[PDB]
Design an enzyme around this catalytic site. Structure first.
Site, PDB file in Angstrom:
ATOM      1  N   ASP A  15       0.793  -1.205   0.000  1.00  0.00           N
ATOM      2  CA  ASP A  15       0.000   0.000   0.000  1.00  0.00           C
ATOM      3  C   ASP A  15       0.833   1.268   0.000  1.00  0.00           C
ATOM      4  O   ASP A  15       0.266   2.329   0.208  1.00  0.00           O
ATOM      5  CB  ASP A  15      -1.037   0.012   1.140  1.00  0.00           C
ATOM      6  CG  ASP A  15      -0.438  -0.135   2.509  1.00  0.00           C
ATOM      7  OD1 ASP A  15       0.771   0.195   2.677  1.00  0.00           O
ATOM      8  OD2 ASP A  15      -1.195  -0.522   3.444  1.00  0.00           O
ATOM      9  N   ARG A  29       0.956   6.764   0.037  1.00  0.00           N
ATOM     10  CA  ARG A  29       0.183   5.795   0.749  1.00  0.00           C
ATOM     11  C   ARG A  29      -1.193   5.746   0.165  1.00  0.00           C
ATOM     12  O   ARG A  29      -1.839   6.751   0.018  1.00  0.00           O
ATOM     13  CB  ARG A  29       0.148   6.209   2.233  1.00  0.00           C
ATOM     14  CG  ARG A  29      -0.664   5.348   3.191  1.00  0.00           C
ATOM     15  CD  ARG A  29      -0.241   3.898   3.194  1.00  0.00           C
ATOM     16  NE  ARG A  29      -0.859   3.142   4.309  1.00  0.00           N
ATOM     17  CZ  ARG A  29      -2.064   2.576   4.212  1.00  0.00           C
ATOM     18  NH1 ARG A  29      -2.766   2.612   3.113  1.00  0.00           N
ATOM     19  NH2 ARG A  29      -2.514   1.888   5.219  1.00  0.00           N
ATOM     20  N   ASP A  34      -5.713  -1.054   3.704  1.00  0.00           N
ATOM     21  CA  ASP A  34      -4.590  -1.539   4.559  1.00  0.00           C
ATOM     22  C   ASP A  34      -4.196  -2.903   4.048  1.00  0.00           C
ATOM     23  O   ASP A  34      -4.983  -3.834   4.111  1.00  0.00           O
ATOM     24  CB  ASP A  34      -5.032  -1.582   6.025  1.00  0.00           C
ATOM     25  CG  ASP A  34      -3.845  -1.765   6.997  1.00  0.00           C
ATOM     26  OD1 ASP A  34      -2.764  -1.297   6.677  1.00  0.00           O
ATOM     27  OD2 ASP A  34      -4.147  -2.413   8.019  1.00  0.00           O
ATOM     28  N   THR A  35      -2.965  -3.004   3.582  1.00  0.00           N
ATOM     29  CA  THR A  35      -2.349  -4.277   3.267  1.00  0.00           C
ATOM     30  C   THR A  35      -1.575  -4.757   4.466  1.00  0.00           C
ATOM     31  O   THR A  35      -1.070  -3.962   5.200  1.00  0.00           O
ATOM     32  CB  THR A  35      -1.440  -4.151   2.054  1.00  0.00           C
ATOM     33  OG1 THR A  35      -0.450  -3.115   2.170  1.00  0.00           O
ATOM     34  CG2 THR A  35      -2.229  -3.914   0.812  1.00  0.00           C
ATOM     35  N   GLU A  37       1.649  -5.874   6.496  1.00  0.00           N
ATOM     36  CA  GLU A  37       3.086  -5.572   6.391  1.00  0.00           C
ATOM     37  C   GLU A  37       3.738  -6.792   5.782  1.00  0.00           C
ATOM     38  O   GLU A  37       3.202  -7.910   5.823  1.00  0.00           O
ATOM     39  CB  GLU A  37       3.693  -5.213   7.760  1.00  0.00           C
ATOM     40  CG  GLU A  37       2.985  -4.056   8.471  1.00  0.00           C
ATOM     41  CD  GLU A  37       3.049  -2.725   7.738  1.00  0.00           C
ATOM     42  OE1 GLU A  37       4.113  -2.517   7.105  1.00  0.00           O
ATOM     43  OE2 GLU A  37       2.070  -1.865   7.782  1.00  0.00           O
ATOM     44  N   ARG A  75       3.836  11.338   3.620  1.00  0.00           N
ATOM     45  CA  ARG A  75       3.435  10.515   2.501  1.00  0.00           C
ATOM     46  C   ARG A  75       2.247  11.139   1.803  1.00  0.00           C
ATOM     47  O   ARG A  75       1.338  11.623   2.473  1.00  0.00           O
ATOM     48  CB  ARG A  75       3.051   9.063   2.936  1.00  0.00           C
ATOM     49  CG  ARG A  75       4.124   8.417   3.714  1.00  0.00           C
ATOM     50  CD  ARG A  75       3.826   6.993   4.115  1.00  0.00           C
ATOM     51  NE  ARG A  75       2.743   6.969   5.041  1.00  0.00           N
ATOM     52  CZ  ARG A  75       2.220   5.895   5.594  1.00  0.00           C
ATOM     53  NH1 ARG A  75       2.679   4.678   5.326  1.00  0.00           N
ATOM     54  NH2 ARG A  75       1.111   5.997   6.296  1.00  0.00           N
TER      55      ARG A  75
END
Ligand SMILES: Cc1cn([C@H]2C[C@H](OP(=O)(O)O)[C@@H](COP(=O)(O)O)O2)c(=O)[nH]c1=O
Ligand SMILES: [Ca+2]
Length: 129
Positions: A15, A29, A34-35, A37, A75
């Protein structure tokens, strides 16, 4: 919302991506997702999915929403498109990201992405397996 040009500098993870935007290097971002980690389950697959999508694209575009354009880490916050296909959505549709981080005024594509998520979940894809 409006699409603006950018070029890939480097894939980072599921992401986040480094792009050149208005001639300047920036980490973006992805809005509304949300991917995992990289070190978490499905993280590598998410990384790989995003990497392939942005590296294979002839044309990367950035689309800011109506609110905040950068987060507290500097970001960029945007929807990212690869040859016209939204990476944010594609991740959610493949069960490689959850809809997440839905803040009022940067939520234009919320319903689109919630629909993708529901279909990923119905298919029992990846995170929903
Ligand atoms: C996606 C997104 C993240 N963020 C901030 C919230 C989280 O703060 P914290 O770092 O304090 O948890 C962090 C999550 O990003 P990552 O999922 O990249 O870690 O980024 C925003 O502020 N706005 C956004 O739209
Ligand atoms: Ca993440």
């Amino acid at each position: 919302l409006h699409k603006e040009p950018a070029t890939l500098i480097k894939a980072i993870d599921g992401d986040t991506v480094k792009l050149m935007y208005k001639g300047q290097p920036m980490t973006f971002r992805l809005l509304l997702v949300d991917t995992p980690e990289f070190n978490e389950k499905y993280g590598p697959e998410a990384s790989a999915f995003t990497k392939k999508m942005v590296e294979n694209a002839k044309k990367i575009e950035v689309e800011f929403d109506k609110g905040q354009r950068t987060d507290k880490y500097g970001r960029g916050l945007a929807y990212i498109y690869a040859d016209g296909k939204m990476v944010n959505e594609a991740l959610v549709r493949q069960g490689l990201a959850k809809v997440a981080y839905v803040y009022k005024g940067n939520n234009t594509h919320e319903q689109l992405l919630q629909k993708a998520e529901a279909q990923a979940k119905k298919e029992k894809l990846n995170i929903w397996s």
